[PDB]
């Protein structure tokens, strides 16, 4: 629960997995994949944020699955391929900050993981046009019902074009470890480019 | 749950209600914890970190921290826009505030800085938030120096870079999750701080 130069890895991704695995191992942390996905609309510079679940890392960055077509976050990203996510483990007094450029995950993978999702979920994807305005619950259910009936005669439910994965290619990753002393341990890895060697530094809390 | 009937006129009412419930709930041990998101306006780079919500005032949501030298200060400086999320895991609730930022009154800033513990007051001075340092040692050297610097002093002065900042809401969303995945979503909006609030139901 302390963080020092000695513990730092070469690839920040190592220290992430270590910390993440510890969070999953810890029974105090009941939802370690929960994160805050922040985005912003580039022309105006308006910031929006919401809670999502981190899915997994891949060859290039951090991946998260949701509706990246019609939702608010989709419209921000569409105008500005930049995003930030925070992992906050209250009890472990740890917080990880990832900040990088966004990329749409492979259409195959997007579909692959969409299949694993429960049937009720697969259908919900279709029925709900995330972030769109509606009249009420009724309108919502009417849609669920219609779709549940629409795909009733069908083994595997198809994946919507607007649903899938998106990945954040890190340009900055910060490992923050709090101490009741208020003098928390702060370390941040950075590279101006996805092709620049990572650089670690200690930040004042 | 969450239905049209429960909606208030001033979103701020529904907020307090929800917040008070979170404080009342022993499951929610840190209901003031929030994610404060900001973005550097020219480049459009997004940064975010965890902070504590302090309280509302006549105009918006206030948070106290270093709004001068820190990363968030540099984002806000270039783009007076921010967003914060309140997430109460157990209550299955999340509140989203999105508005323009404003620097809280210098008096208030100082007033609340006084209430903070002495160790804290000193820490504000010693630590140049987000600045790069060599190691813990450099840090402590600074703490020690400041602890000694302000040793001969009753009340410790407030740094210019420390204080409060408020978010004047343009969008407030009340999200209530249901294991059914068909969460209740309501969002209040006004294009301007002088435009009547407007409630609407969003698809989950
Ligand atoms: C713990 C938690 C997990 C969530 N996971 C997801 C998810 O995997 N996919 C998704 O689309 N929305 C998810 N949501 C919903 C979003 O927080 C929220 O509905 C948001 O509005 C979605 O996009 P928007 O901000 O662009 O409207 C989750 C919410 C919570 C509280
Ligand atoms: C639970 C929690 C509460 C925090 N509260 C505060 C706070 O009240 N003020 C502050 O300046 N930083 C606070 N921090 C630290 C910030 O999240 C983080 O160090 C951030 O980097 C500060 O500003 P920056 O993003 O501009 O560097 C808190 C962190 C955690 C995990």
UniProtKB/Swiss-Prot annotation, chain A:
GO BP terms: pyridoxal 5'-phosphate salvage; pyridoxine biosynthetic process
Q: Which reaction does it catalyse?
A: pyridoxamine 5'-phosphate + O2 + H2O = pyridoxal 5'-phosphate + H2O2 + NH4(+); pyridoxine 5'-phosphate + O2 = pyridoxal 5'-phosphate + H2O2
- One Pfam family this chain carries? PNP_phzG_C
Q: Where does the record put the Glycyl lysine isopeptide (Lys-Gly) (interchain with G-Cter in ubiquitin) cross-link? A: 6
Q: In which pathway does it act?
A: Cofactor metabolism; pyridoxal 5'-phosphate salvage; pyridoxal 5'-phosphate from pyridoxamine 5'-phosphate: step 1/1; Cofactor metabolism; pyridoxal 5'-phosphate salvage; pyridoxal 5'-phosphate from pyridoxine 5'-phosphate: step 1/1
The answer, when asked if Flavoprotein is one of the entry's keywords, is: yes
- Residues given in the record as pyridoxal 5'-phosphate binding sites: 55, 113, 117, 121, 182-184
Which InterPro entries does the annotation name?
Answer: Pyridox_Oxase, Pyridox_Oxase_CS, Pyridox_Oxase_N, Pyridoxamine_oxidase_dimer_C, Split_barrel_FMN-bd
Places the protein is found = Mitochondrion intermembrane space
Sample GO molecular function, one term: pyridoxamine phosphate oxidase activity
Stored PROSITE patterns: PYRIDOX_OXIDASE
**Cofactor needs:** FMN
Instruction: List the EC numbers from the record.
Output: 1.4.3.5
The note describing how and how many cofactors are bound reads: Binds 1 FMN per subunit.
Q: Which family does it belong to?
A: Belongs to the pyridoxamine 5'-phosphate oxidase family.
Which PANTHER family does the protein's record reference? PYRIDOXINE-5'-PHOSPHATE OXIDASE, PYRIDOXINE-5-PHOSPHATE OXIDASE
Which purpose does this protein serve, as stated in its record? Answer: Catalyzes the oxidation of either pyridoxine 5'-phosphate (PNP) or pyridoxamine 5'-phosphate (PMP) into pyridoxal 5'-phosphate (PLP).
Note the subunit structure.
Homodimer.
Q: What is this protein called?
A: Pyridoxamine 5'-phosphate oxidase
Source species: Saccharomyces cerevisiae (strain ATCC 204508 / S288c) (Baker's yeast)
């Amino acid at each position: 629960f302390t963080l020092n130069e000695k513990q730092l890895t070469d690839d920040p991704i190592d220290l992430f997995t270590k910390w993440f695995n510890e969070a999953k191992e810890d029974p105090r942390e009941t939802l370690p994949e929960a994160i805050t996905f922040s985005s912003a609309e580039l022309p105006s510079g308006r910031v929006s944020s919401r809670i999502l679940l981190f899915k997994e890392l891949d060859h290039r960055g951090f991946t998260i699955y949701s509706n990246w077509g019609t939702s608010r976050k989709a419209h921000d990203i569409a105008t500005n391929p930049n995003a930030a996510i925070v992992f906050f483990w209250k009890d472990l007094q740890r917080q990880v900050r990832v900040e990088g450029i966004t990329e749409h995950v492979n259409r195959e993978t997007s579909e692959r993981y969409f299949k694993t999702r429960p049937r009720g979920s697969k259908i919900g994807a279709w029925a709900s046009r995330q972030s769109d305005v509606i009249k009420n619950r009724e309108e919502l259910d009417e849609l669920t019902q219609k779709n549940t009936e629409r795909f009733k005669d069908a083994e595997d439910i198809p994946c919507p074009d607007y649903w899938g994965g998106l990945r954040i290619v890190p340009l900055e990753i910060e490992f923050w470890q709090g101490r009741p002393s208020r003098l928390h341990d702060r370390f941040v890895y950075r590279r101006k480019t996805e092709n620049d060697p990572w650089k670690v530094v200690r930040l004042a809390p």
